[PDB]
Amino acid sequence: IEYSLPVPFHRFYSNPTICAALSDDIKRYVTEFPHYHRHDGGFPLPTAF
Amino acid sequence: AARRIPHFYRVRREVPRTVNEMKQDFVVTDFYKVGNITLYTELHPFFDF
Amino acid sequence: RISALPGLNNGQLAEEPLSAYVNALHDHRLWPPFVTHLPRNMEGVQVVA
Amino acid sequence: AHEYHNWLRSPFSRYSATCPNVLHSVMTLAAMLYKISPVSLVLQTKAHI
């Protein structure tokens, strides 16, 4: 966990569960907005991607 | 980008839903009804607006 | 997966997600008959002993 | 003994008393928990359920 960084970069590879497990900021984000937890590509990617 | 990814989710603000994504949740029959807001963008089969 | 409506529940209309309005399983006010830990969020819920 | 203020009333146990011990009975018990708020109703209709 300490050496791992999550990279949600594609609508096929952005699983919010893994990112929330690996990153605390993403965990807080998903906690605030539970509807983003879904897996249909509706999870917001960073503005760059 | 990889390091900045946590910083994006650091701020707990939701993002607007893109129009192309909004089209996907109409069923085959009510896509043509007046309730389909997005119809004003569906001008060409081969192109997006 | 059956309980929610994944095709249409992408949004909010209060602090709660859309999935909470459609089915009682996703509503946080409904508690399971047996508990071991208190829920994270209890906005409108008050517990009396 | 406060049936009327409870969430699950008599028909739930009446159904469970005789349902076959199959996955579909679990699925139907989940489906019976759909809420009947106006938001739930518009979501259900838009899915053509």
Short mmCIF file of C-alpha atoms in Angstrom, two decimals:
data_model
loop_
_atom_site.label_atom_id
_atom_site.label_comp_id
_atom_site.label_asym_id
_atom_site.label_seq_id
_atom_site.Cartn_x
_atom_site.Cartn_y
_atom_site.Cartn_z
CA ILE A 1 0.00 0.00 0.00
CA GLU A 2 2.72 2.48 0.97
CA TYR A 3 4.55 2.04 -2.34
CA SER A 4 1.42 1.95 -4.53
CA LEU A 5 -0.15 4.86 -6.41
CA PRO A 6 -3.59 4.56 -8.07
CA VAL A 7 -3.94 5.97 -11.59
CA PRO A 8 -7.51 6.29 -12.89
CA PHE A 9 -6.83 7.23 -16.51
CA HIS A 10 -9.36 5.42 -18.72
CA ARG A 11 -13.09 4.75 -18.63
CA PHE A 12 -12.27 1.03 -18.70
CA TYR A 13 -9.65 1.35 -15.93
CA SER A 14 -10.90 3.79 -13.28
CA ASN A 15 -12.43 1.47 -10.69
CA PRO A 16 -13.42 3.71 -7.75
CA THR A 17 -13.17 0.86 -5.24
CA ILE A 18 -9.48 0.22 -5.90
CA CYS A 19 -8.68 3.94 -5.95
CA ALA A 20 -10.50 4.51 -2.66
CA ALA A 21 -8.62 1.60 -1.10
CA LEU A 22 -5.27 2.96 -2.31
CA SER A 23 -5.83 6.70 -1.80
CA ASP A 24 -7.36 8.49 1.18
CA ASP A 25 -8.32 11.59 -0.81
CA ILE A 26 -10.32 9.49 -3.26
CA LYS A 27 -11.90 7.68 -0.31
CA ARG A 28 -13.10 10.99 1.13
CA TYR A 29 -14.30 12.11 -2.30
CA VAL A 30 -16.37 8.97 -2.81
CA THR A 31 -17.69 9.17 0.76
CA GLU A 32 -18.92 12.70 0.06
CA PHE A 33 -20.51 11.66 -3.26
CA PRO A 34 -21.70 8.04 -3.02
CA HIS A 35 -23.36 8.13 -6.45
CA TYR A 36 -19.91 8.34 -8.03
CA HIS A 37 -19.17 4.82 -6.75
CA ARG A 38 -20.66 3.26 -9.89
CA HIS A 39 -18.69 1.52 -12.65
CA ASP A 40 -20.39 2.69 -15.87
CA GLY A 41 -17.76 5.31 -16.70
CA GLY A 42 -19.57 7.98 -14.69
CA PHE A 43 -16.72 8.30 -12.21
CA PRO A 44 -15.07 11.70 -12.81
CA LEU A 45 -11.60 11.45 -14.27
CA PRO A 46 -9.10 14.24 -13.52
CA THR A 47 -9.38 17.29 -15.75
CA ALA A 48 -6.22 16.33 -17.65
CA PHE A 49 -7.69 12.99 -18.71
CA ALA B 1 -0.03 14.05 -13.73
CA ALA B 2 0.35 10.92 -11.59
CA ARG B 3 1.33 12.91 -8.50
CA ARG B 4 -1.32 15.55 -9.19
CA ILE B 5 -4.11 12.95 -9.39
CA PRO B 6 -4.75 13.00 -5.59
CA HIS B 7 -4.85 16.80 -5.67
CA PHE B 8 -7.82 16.73 -8.05
CA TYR B 9 -9.94 14.69 -5.65
CA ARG B 10 -8.60 16.68 -2.70
CA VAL B 11 -11.35 19.23 -3.38
CA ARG B 12 -14.80 17.74 -2.80
CA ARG B 13 -16.68 19.31 -5.70
CA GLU B 14 -18.74 17.35 -8.20
CA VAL B 15 -18.33 17.88 -11.94
CA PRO B 16 -20.96 18.51 -14.65
CA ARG B 17 -22.15 15.49 -16.62
CA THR B 18 -21.23 15.60 -20.30
CA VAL B 19 -24.01 15.71 -22.88
CA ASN B 20 -22.84 12.57 -24.67
CA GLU B 21 -23.14 10.66 -21.40
CA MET B 22 -26.66 12.01 -20.85
CA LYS B 23 -27.83 10.53 -24.16
CA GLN B 24 -27.08 6.99 -23.02
CA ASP B 25 -29.85 6.60 -20.42
CA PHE B 26 -32.83 7.07 -22.72
CA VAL B 27 -34.51 3.85 -23.80
CA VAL B 28 -35.00 3.12 -27.49
CA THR B 29 -38.58 4.40 -27.63
CA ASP B 30 -38.43 7.60 -25.55
CA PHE B 31 -35.24 8.83 -27.22
CA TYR B 32 -37.58 10.33 -29.83
CA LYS B 33 -39.96 11.95 -27.34
CA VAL B 34 -39.95 15.64 -26.48
CA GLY B 35 -38.45 14.81 -23.09
CA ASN B 36 -35.10 14.07 -24.76
CA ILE B 37 -33.32 17.36 -24.14
CA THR B 38 -30.23 16.32 -26.09
CA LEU B 39 -32.02 15.99 -29.45
CA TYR B 40 -30.94 19.48 -30.50
CA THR B 41 -27.37 18.15 -30.74
CA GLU B 42 -28.09 14.94 -32.71
CA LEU B 43 -27.64 16.43 -36.17
CA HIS B 44 -25.38 14.01 -38.07
CA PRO B 45 -24.97 10.23 -37.74
CA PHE B 46 -21.20 10.37 -38.16
CA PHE B 47 -20.39 13.40 -35.97
CA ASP B 48 -20.84 14.68 -32.42
CA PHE B 49 -22.00 18.13 -31.36
CA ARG C 1 -27.09 -4.86 -8.53
CA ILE C 2 -30.79 -5.61 -8.96
CA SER C 3 -31.76 -3.30 -6.09
CA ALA C 4 -30.49 -0.04 -7.58
CA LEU C 5 -31.13 1.42 -11.02
CA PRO C 6 -27.54 1.81 -12.27
CA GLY C 7 -28.65 3.21 -15.62
CA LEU C 8 -30.39 6.26 -14.16
CA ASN C 9 -29.16 6.85 -10.58
CA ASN C 10 -26.26 9.18 -11.53
CA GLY C 11 -27.03 12.30 -9.55
CA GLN C 12 -28.19 13.99 -6.37
CA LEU C 13 -31.19 16.07 -5.39
CA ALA C 14 -30.21 16.53 -1.73
CA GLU C 15 -27.28 15.30 0.34
CA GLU C 16 -28.55 11.83 -0.61
CA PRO C 17 -27.81 10.08 -3.92
CA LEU C 18 -30.56 9.20 -6.36
CA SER C 19 -30.18 5.51 -5.50
CA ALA C 20 -31.47 6.21 -1.99
CA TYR C 21 -34.79 7.52 -3.31
CA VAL C 22 -35.53 4.51 -5.51
CA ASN C 23 -34.94 1.60 -3.12
CA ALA C 24 -34.96 1.23 0.65
CA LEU C 25 -31.80 -0.91 0.63
CA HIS C 26 -29.73 2.12 -0.36
CA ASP C 27 -31.54 4.43 2.08
CA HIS C 28 -29.46 4.93 5.22
CA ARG C 29 -32.52 5.41 7.44
CA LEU C 30 -33.35 1.70 7.21
CA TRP C 31 -31.19 -0.26 9.62
CA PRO C 32 -30.41 -3.98 9.48
CA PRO C 33 -32.08 -5.97 12.28
CA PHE C 34 -28.70 -6.90 13.80
CA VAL C 35 -25.91 -4.34 14.18
CA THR C 36 -22.29 -4.53 15.28
CA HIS C 37 -21.11 -1.03 14.33
CA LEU C 38 -23.01 2.22 14.17
CA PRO C 39 -23.36 3.68 10.66
CA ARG C 40 -21.02 6.38 9.44
CA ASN C 41 -23.83 8.84 8.69
CA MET C 42 -26.96 9.44 10.75
CA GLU C 43 -28.26 12.81 9.49
CA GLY C 44 -31.96 12.44 10.22
CA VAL C 45 -31.60 9.37 12.42
CA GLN C 46 -31.66 9.45 16.22
CA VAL C 47 -31.01 6.31 18.27
CA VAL C 48 -32.54 5.84 21.71
CA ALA C 49 -31.45 3.27 24.27
CA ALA D 1 -45.72 -4.23 18.30
CA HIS D 2 -45.79 -0.97 16.29
CA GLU D 3 -46.55 -2.41 12.85
CA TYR D 4 -47.78 0.79 11.23
CA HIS D 5 -44.64 2.77 12.05
CA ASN D 6 -42.35 -0.06 10.91
CA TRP D 7 -40.87 -0.17 7.42
CA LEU D 8 -41.72 -3.80 6.58
CA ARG D 9 -45.36 -4.67 7.24
CA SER D 10 -47.30 -7.95 7.26
CA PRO D 11 -47.14 -8.82 3.51
CA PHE D 12 -43.35 -9.21 3.72
CA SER D 13 -43.47 -12.01 6.29
CA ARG D 14 -46.58 -13.41 4.61
CA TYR D 15 -44.55 -13.75 1.40
CA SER D 16 -41.43 -15.12 3.08
CA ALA D 17 -43.44 -17.75 4.97
CA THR D 18 -44.09 -19.75 1.78
CA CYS D 19 -41.52 -18.64 -0.81
CA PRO D 20 -39.25 -21.34 -2.27
CA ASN D 21 -35.65 -21.30 -1.06
CA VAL D 22 -34.21 -20.14 -4.37
CA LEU D 23 -32.21 -17.10 -5.49
CA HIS D 24 -35.26 -15.60 -7.17
CA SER D 25 -37.06 -15.36 -3.84
CA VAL D 26 -34.20 -13.22 -2.53
CA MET D 27 -34.40 -11.11 -5.68
CA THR D 28 -38.15 -10.61 -5.22
CA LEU D 29 -37.70 -9.63 -1.58
CA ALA D 30 -35.24 -7.00 -2.77
CA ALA D 31 -37.64 -5.83 -5.48
CA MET D 32 -40.46 -5.43 -2.95
CA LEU D 33 -38.32 -2.83 -1.15
CA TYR D 34 -38.66 -0.27 -3.96
CA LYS D 35 -39.86 3.04 -2.51
CA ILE D 36 -42.94 4.86 -3.80
CA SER D 37 -41.86 8.49 -3.58
CA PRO D 38 -42.43 10.67 -6.67
CA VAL D 39 -38.70 10.57 -7.44
CA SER D 40 -38.80 6.79 -7.26
CA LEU D 41 -41.83 6.78 -9.54
CA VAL D 42 -40.22 8.94 -12.24
CA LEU D 43 -37.02 6.88 -12.07
CA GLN D 44 -38.98 3.64 -12.40
CA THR D 45 -41.04 4.90 -15.33
CA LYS D 46 -37.99 6.22 -17.18
CA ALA D 47 -36.57 2.69 -16.97
CA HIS D 48 -39.93 1.38 -18.26
CA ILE D 49 -40.19 -0.84 -15.20
#
